[PDB]
């Protein structure tokens, strides 16, 4: 948690349905966005922060929250945007000898700024006489080691926490979600919607040969009459369905 890893996610589609088998018993309580509508959403910036904290310390991962993890290990900004995911890992991060490999910062001169990492191993001076490299009384190592106790409740068990931070510009988007598709129906009055281009008309085979970069097709009336299907590279004519005045 003190040396928390930071990861960049971009230029990809984010699928959130996978995060049930990989991370069972997960908690998706988060801030800044509705969890449900994340599937049809676009993110321009994504940060991933992952570490392991104790069960009693999972509540400390929240904006405006103070504590041992918050002040000395990982501080969240008040205006934090993005969501956090935490699930139990007793089957993975618990050893019969003891999970002594996970350390956290315990003594620190001042509370950490949001989204900051401290890897210093200097001996902390909690008194008046300088430590001078001695770890005796009034001179404690700033980092202590987790001693996970699976025998007790979940508060003394290793919790794997992954912190995701976004910005939600949804204009220069590089991370988005799937939208699926339906099979093509032709030669009838059809409500179509191609990449957000909703319209009604009759979809017929098109003889036009517009260039590979060239996507749409416009007319004199400055309306889209020709379209190329994103699923299959084919040319379609969009014609308004037969109409006319009745007398």
């Amino acid at each position, epitope marked *: 948690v*003190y*040396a*928390w*890893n*930071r990861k960049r996610i971009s230029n990809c589609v984010a699928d959130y349905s996978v995060l049930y088998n990989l991370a069972p018993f997960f908690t998706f309580k988060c801030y800044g966005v509705s969890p449900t509508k994340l599937n049809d959403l676009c993110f321009t910036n994504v940060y991933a922060d992952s570490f392991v904290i104790r069960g009693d310390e999972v509540r400390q991962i929240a904006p405006g929250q103070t504590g041992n993890i918050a002040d000395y290990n990982y501080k969240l900004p008040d205006d934090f945007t993005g969501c956090v995911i935490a699930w139990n890992s007793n089957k993975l991060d618990s*050893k*019969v*000898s003891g999970n*002594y*490999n*996970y*350390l956290y910062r315990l003594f620190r001169k001042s509370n950490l700024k949001p989204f900051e*990492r401290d*890897i210093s*191993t200097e001996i902390y001076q909690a008194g008046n006489k300088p430590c001078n490299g001695v770890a005796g009384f009034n001179c404690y190592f700033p*980092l202590r*080691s987790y001693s996970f106790r699976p025998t007790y409740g979940v508060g003394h068990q290793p919790y794997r926490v992954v912190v995701l931070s976004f910005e939600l510009l949804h204009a220069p988007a590089t991370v988005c979600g799937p939208k699926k598709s339906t099979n093509l129906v032709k030669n009838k009055c059809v409500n179509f919607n191609f990449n957000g281009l909703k319209g009604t008309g009759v979809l017929t085979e098109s003889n036009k040969k517009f260039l590979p970069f060239q996507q749409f097709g416009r007319d004199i009336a400055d309306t889209t009459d020709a379209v190329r299907d994103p699923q299959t590279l084919e040319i379609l004519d969009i014609t308004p369905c037969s109409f006319g005045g009745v007398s």
Partner: antibody, heavy 122, light 111 residues
Framework: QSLEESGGDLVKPGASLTLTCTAS?????????MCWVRQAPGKGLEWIAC????????IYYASWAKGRFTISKTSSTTVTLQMTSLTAADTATYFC???????????????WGPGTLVTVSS | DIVMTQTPASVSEPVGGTVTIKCQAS??????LAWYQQKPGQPPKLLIY???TLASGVPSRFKGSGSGTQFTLTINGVECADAATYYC????????????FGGGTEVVVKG
């Protein structure tokens, strides 16, 4: 505990050899991991391949040791490593690393065996 | 995936002198790193596991500093008997790795 090696001898190029790591005083428990390493006579250590001593062997291999080598467990206190198509550069000193944590891979190695020397000549 | 280098290759300090060996990783390995030292004709032994915790039977002079990508081992004192090679292990992600162990760094103590 000891992890004395076996099966080390002069071998012709393009051949096969069977190196055996035998444990003494303990058995290959599931909660603790074992790995295999070797040391060239002139340069530092390297990792090639090894398997876990658990119920489900989480066998793991190195990039330069992708398919030439083969490691399997034959008994609770006997593990063997098989390599084929041995070349001139394969000569080294082979050690039987003993891990301390079963995180699906070589973690901190607290105990090593005395090791064996495998050389190639024609 | 992770490529680790150990520098300097050769070091030489007086018996009362201090020498430091730094171990650098291609990407962050957090706290997962170990230090190993072998004498000629002898397999190496674990010295500094988790990059800070001292081993058993080892003098306190052996220590560890740094975290994430750069890890440094500082030698406070030699006694002409610690002249050997030091290696660092990534012990972080070994799915497809050519070698978890780092480069070789022998220590020469001029007594």
């Amino acid at each position: 505990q000891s992890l004395e090696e076996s099966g080390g001898d002069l071998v012709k190029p393009g051949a096969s050899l069977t190196l055996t790591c035998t444990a003494s005083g303990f058995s290959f428990s599931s909660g603790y991991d074992m790995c295999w390493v070797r040391q060239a006579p002139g340069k530092g250590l390297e990792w090639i391949a090894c398997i876990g001593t658990g119920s489900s062997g989480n066998i793991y291999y190195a990039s330069w040791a992708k398919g030439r080598f083969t490691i399997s467990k034959t008994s609770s206190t006997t593990v063997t490593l098989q390599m084929t198509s041995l070349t001139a550069a394969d000569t080294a000193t082979y050690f039987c690393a003993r891990d301390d944590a079963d995180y699906a891979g070589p973690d901190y190695f607290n105990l090593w065996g005395p090791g064996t020397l495998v050389t190639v000549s024609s | 995936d992770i490529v680790m280098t150990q520098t300097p290759a050769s070091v030489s300090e007086p018996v009362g002198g201090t020498v430091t060996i730094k171990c650098q990783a291609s990407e962050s390995i957090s706290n997962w790193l170990a230090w190993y030292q072998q004498k000629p004709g002898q397999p190496p032994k674990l010295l500094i596991y988790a990059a800070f915790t001292l081993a058993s039977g080892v003098p306190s002079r052996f220590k560890g500093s740094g975290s994430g990508t750069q890890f440094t081992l500082t030698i406070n004192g030699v006694e002409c008997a610690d002249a050997a090679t030091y290696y660092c292990q990534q012990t972080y992600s070994s799915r497809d790795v050519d070698n978890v162990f780092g480069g070789g760094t022998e220590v020469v103590v001029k007594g």
